[PDB]
Amino acid sequence: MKLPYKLQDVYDGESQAKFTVISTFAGGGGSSTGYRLAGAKILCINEFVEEARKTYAANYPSTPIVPDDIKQLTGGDFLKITGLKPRELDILDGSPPCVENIEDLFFEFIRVAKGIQPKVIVAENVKGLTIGEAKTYYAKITNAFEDIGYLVTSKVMKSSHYGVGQARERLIFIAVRQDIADKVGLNILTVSSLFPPTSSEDTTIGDIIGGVEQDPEYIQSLVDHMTKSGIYKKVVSKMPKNPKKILSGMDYNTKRASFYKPSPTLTASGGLIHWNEDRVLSVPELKRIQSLPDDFILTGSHSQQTERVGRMVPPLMMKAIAENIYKEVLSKL
Numbered sequence: 494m495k496l497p498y499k500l501q502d503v504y505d506g507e508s509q510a511k512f513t514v515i516s517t518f519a520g521g522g523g524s525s526t527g528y529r530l531a532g533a534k535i536l537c538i539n540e541f542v543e544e545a546r547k548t549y550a551a552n553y554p555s556t557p558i559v560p561d562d563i564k565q566l567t568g569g570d571f572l573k574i575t576g577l578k579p580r581e582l583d584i585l586d587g588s589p590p591c592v593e594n595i596e597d598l599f600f601e602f603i604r605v606a607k608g609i610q611p612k613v614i615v616a617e618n619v620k621g622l623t624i625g626e627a628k629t630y631y632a633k634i635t636n637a638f639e640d641i642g643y644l645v646t647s648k649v650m651k652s653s654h655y656g657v658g659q660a661r662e663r664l665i666f667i668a669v670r671q672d673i674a675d676k677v678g679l680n681i682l683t684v685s686s687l688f689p690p691t692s693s694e695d696t697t698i699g700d701i702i703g704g705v706e707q708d709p710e711y712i713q714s715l716v717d718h719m720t721k722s723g724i725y726k727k728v729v730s731k732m733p734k735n736p737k738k739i740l741s742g743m744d745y746n747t748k749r750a751s752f753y754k755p756s757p758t759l760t761a762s763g764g765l766i767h768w769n770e771d772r773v774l775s776v777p778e779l780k781r782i783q784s785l786p787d788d789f790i791l792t793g794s795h796s797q798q799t800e801r802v803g804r805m806v807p808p809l810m811m812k813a814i815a816e817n818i819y820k821e822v823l824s825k826l
């Protein structure tokens with residue numbers, strides 16, 4: 494897909510209804526958006542933050558929303574909600590967030606997937622890990638998917654290889670029910686073919702940012718709030734404009750984006766500096782960098798909107814993932 498696009502293209506793709514998806518940890522719906530673009534019928538979502546639901550519902554008013562804490566839910570609950578039998582769901586989606594006990598919602602996700610028995614699981618993992626925990630933890634995740642009867646593969650994907658002007662790198666698991674994997678012929682040596690081919694060679698901000706609608710008064714107010722603030726006086730005022738590379742505020746975290754590089758990763762805290770203007774990036778720019786449609790509705794305060802975009806999987810990368818799963822697995826059934 495090419496940027497920009499609008500919600501109506503998402504609805505058009507969704508109207509194909511070529512495979513079924515449940516999106517857990519649905520957020521504002523970055524993942525859902527990409528599934529819908531690839532032809533998915535979103536059967537329902539799970540999302541327990543009120544403002545994420547308000548944003549999701551504003552863009553996708555038809556999609557049923559389960560508001561519960563995932564810890565209170567079973568796969569059978571989802572099956573009952575959507576009218577499905579086990580094994581019937583095509584894709585279960587999730588991006589769980591994040592001595593004393595610390596909850597791990599990724600393992601809550603696995604527990605729910607055990608009840609649903611989806612044909613395919615797509616799960617991004619963003620657990621912050623100590624040294625000496627990371628590799629052992631991903632091995633525990635892999636074993637856990639195999640325990641519930643799945644062939645599983647994993648890879649760090651960089652969204653700028655799939656048309657998104659952002660260097661967002663996150664580990665994504667794809668797992669296929671052993672049943673389905675056998676029918677389609679997937680094995681340990683072909684399983685990595687579930688990850689989509691790379692379409693670009695590091696899409697930059699410049700490649701995708703052209704033509705964003707944006708009121709100069711709103712943009713000016715961003716510059717004004719910036720210029721009269723501490724991080725400007727101490728850091729940003731010392732950062733060159735139009736950099737040829739991402740700049741770190743510690744060489745002068747606060748980072749300055751470059752027009753000629755993929756964007757710095759958008760995060761929930763959202764502190765990225767525009768490449769040209771002494772101000773943070775705007776919500777319209779963040780939407781475009783995230784590869785959302787231009788008319789995507791975000792609710793709440795400026796800070797809540799930046800957070801909601803920051804926590805997303807870029808729709809266009811998830812579109813690539815969903816297309817590839819449909820061609821390589823679901824279209825053979």
Ligand SMILES: Nc1ncnc2c1ncn2[C@@H]1O[C@H](C[S@+](CC[C@H]([NH3+])C(=O)[O-])CC(=O)[O-])[C@@H](O)[C@H]1O
Pocket residue numbers: 517518519520521522523524525539540541542545561562563564587588589590591598619804805806807
């Ligand atoms: N216990 C819970 N129960 C239900 N929902 C929860 C729970 N805990 C956190 N959440 C919610 O799961 C989402 C995780 S973000 C999803 C972005 C999506 N992939 C997107 O493309 O927009 C990614 C991240 O924050 O790491 C948030 O919206 C939380 O409110």
